[PDB]
Amino acid sequence: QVRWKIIESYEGNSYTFIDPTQLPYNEKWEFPRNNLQFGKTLGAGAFGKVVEATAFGLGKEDAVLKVAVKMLKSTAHADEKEALMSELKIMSHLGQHENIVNLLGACTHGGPVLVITEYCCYGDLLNFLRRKSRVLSTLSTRDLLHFSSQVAQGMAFLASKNCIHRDVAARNVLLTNGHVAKIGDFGLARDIMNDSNYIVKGNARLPVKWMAPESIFDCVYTVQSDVWSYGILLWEIFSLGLNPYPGILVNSKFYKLVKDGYQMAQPAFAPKNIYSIMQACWALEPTHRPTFQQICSFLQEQAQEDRRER
Numbered sequence: 001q002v003r004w005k006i007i008e009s010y011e012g013n014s015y016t017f018i019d020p021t022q023l024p025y026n027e028k029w030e031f032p033r034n035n036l037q038f039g040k041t042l043g044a045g046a047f048g049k050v051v052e053a054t055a056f057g058l059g060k061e062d063a064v065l066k067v068a069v070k071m072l073k074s075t076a077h078a079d080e081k082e083a084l085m086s087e088l089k090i091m092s093h094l095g096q097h098e099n100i101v102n103l104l105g106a107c108t109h110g111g112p113v114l115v116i117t118e119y120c121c122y123g124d125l126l127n128f129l130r131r132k133s134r135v136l137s138t139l140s141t142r143d144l145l146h147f148s149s150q151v152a153q154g155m156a157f158l159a160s161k162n163c164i165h166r167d168v169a170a171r172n173v174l175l176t177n178g179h180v181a182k183i184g185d186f187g188l189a190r191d192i193m194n195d196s197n198y199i200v201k202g203n204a205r206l207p208v209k210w211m212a213p214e215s216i217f218d219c220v221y222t223v224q225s226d227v228w229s230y231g232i233l234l235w236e237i238f239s240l241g242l243n244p245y246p247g248i249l250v251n252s253k254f255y256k257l258v259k260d261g262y263q264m265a266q267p268a269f270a271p272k273n274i275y276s277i278m279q280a281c282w283a284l285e286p287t288h289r290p291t292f293q294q295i296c297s298f299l300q301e302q303a304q305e306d307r308r309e310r
């Protein structure tokens, strides 16, 4: 699966007392549907879509601002409504963080369910990288480090809530004001069917090139498997957005390689220290992978060194 999920953790640092899917919606998020003016469709998958809108009088400051609004398509049935509400329930439970696309409100009465989140004006990180890659201001190591750290903090936050992401990738990072990176559960805005990076596995479509071997082979999904995917994301960032495993098709030979410990070569713009993060993320043994907090800490050191020399 490609949506966010809360898991149970024992004798970990964080404890799951409740499953947010249960104990339904808190009507404190409720926002007047009529105070939404819809704009362009930002993206859409099989069951739902995300559209840009202006919201009037939203929040404590009740400002007028651009927001993103998620909603179902016509093809959506009961199963689809539940999953949307379930996504709403998780975002309301997680709480806020600077590097997550935050819940601003919802319309669950008087019409179709709408979920209102912060609008990220610059779009996805992968496109941004590929555009910067072919310009003639040009990106510097400090920018690439900042993206890396901001995503790492978002993921360290999720990990602290026993929440797994399951689709970490540059296509799934958004850039908002100041080009700050944010992550979120973007499935419904993702046209998975028409993105060839999602490979058909019988009944599912999975981002095979981003997935830890245990996720691919055992269908295991943990914070540690998210750490592997974050390493692939790092490789994307410091290659300025090449497709992972360049040239290498996804077929039985691909699986044997990753199984057997194959790892991508150092990207053009990764310092050796950043490549060492990638390698640590791609440890075959999941418990030998760093935590997101350890990654944050180490990236913090790389940023100060850059700030000292540069």
Ligand SMILES: C[C@@H]1CN(c2ccc(Nc3ncc4c(=O)c(C(N)=O)cn(-c5ccc6c(c5)CCC6)c4n3)cc2)C[C@H](C)N1
Pocket (backbone or CB within 6 Å): 042, 043, 044, 050, 068, 070, 101, 117, 118, 119, 120, 121, 122, 123, 124, 127, 171, 172, 174, 184, 185, 186, 187, 188, 189, 190, 191
């Ligand atoms: C096609 C066009 C899309 N253009 C663009 C896309 C997204 C956003 N801004 C934004 N702001 C908040 C959210 C959410 O809150 C949210 C959610 N909560 O699920 C989901 N998306 C979202 C929408 C579409 C797509 C994705 C994510 C990934 C695949 C395509 C958001 N997008 C701004 C510009 C960038 C341009 C270069 N090319």
